[PDB]
């Protein structure tokens, strides 16, 4: 189901997304969520994210609940508040959302351990897209990445399910992308979602 760049729907070009505010651009019922980011102990700003419920409803709803606190295990909420970005590769992507262990091992979703790939409709055609991290087919969980360049070699292996909105969002993404990392691409100073929610 993969669309070529010439076939893309309105509202998801880089220019269109950078004009976005707090309301969705691809489909009017798409939720918009946010992360406030701290780099070390410094508030770095806010990333606003449209979740493409119209194209990837299960992936969007999983991410959305992790932003709002609506997913509970035995009455205890769990989600992205306090989650880190544990793997940062300049000119490629920033990876985070492992609220389980903070190291890439976390594989919990609102559906259980892992959930299937939805249709691979959108390509990784530009920076600023949200896509699911996984360990092969049908192993989506809680982790995600934000593209920092086109990464079309990931097409049909990772579901692109959202986009950042507005220029500040991309400024924060670029700041995260350029922090110092160790030999394993782990940041030397933590990058944390200190607050998150739905707009």
């Amino acid at each position: 189901s993969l669309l070529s760049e010439s076939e893309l729907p309105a509202g998801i070009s880089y220019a269109e997304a950078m004009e976005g505010g707090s309301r969705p651009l691809l489909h009017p019922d798409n939720p918009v969520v946010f992360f406030d980011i701290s780099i070390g102990s410094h508030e770095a700003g806010r990333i606003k994210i449209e979740l493409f419920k119209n194209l990837a409803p299960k992936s969007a709803e999983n991410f959305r609940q992790f932003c709002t606190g609506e997913f509970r295990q035995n009455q205890v909420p769990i989600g992205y508040k306090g989650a880190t970005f544990h793997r940062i590769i300049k000119n490629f992507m920033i990876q985070g959302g492992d609220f389980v262990k903070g190291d890439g091992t976390g594989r919990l979703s609102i559906y259980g351990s892992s959930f299937p790939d939805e249709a691979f409709v959108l390509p990784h055609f530009r920076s600023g897209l949200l896509s699911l991290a996984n360990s092969g087919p049908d192993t989506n969980g809680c982790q995600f990445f934000i593209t920092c360049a086109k990464c079309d070699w990931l097409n049909r292996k990772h579901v692109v399910f959202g986009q950042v909105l507005g220029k500040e969002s991309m400024q924060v993404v670029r700041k995260i992308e350029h922090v110092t990392v160790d030999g394993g691409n782990r940041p030397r100073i933590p990058v944390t979602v200190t607050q998150c929610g739905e707009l």
Binding site: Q95, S135, C151, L154
Partner: peptide, 11 residues
């Protein structure tokens, strides 16, 4: 390489 996995990170 440039993959985004959860568990065995590769080059």
């Amino acid at each position: 390489x440039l993959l985004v996995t959860a568990x065995x990170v590769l080059a």
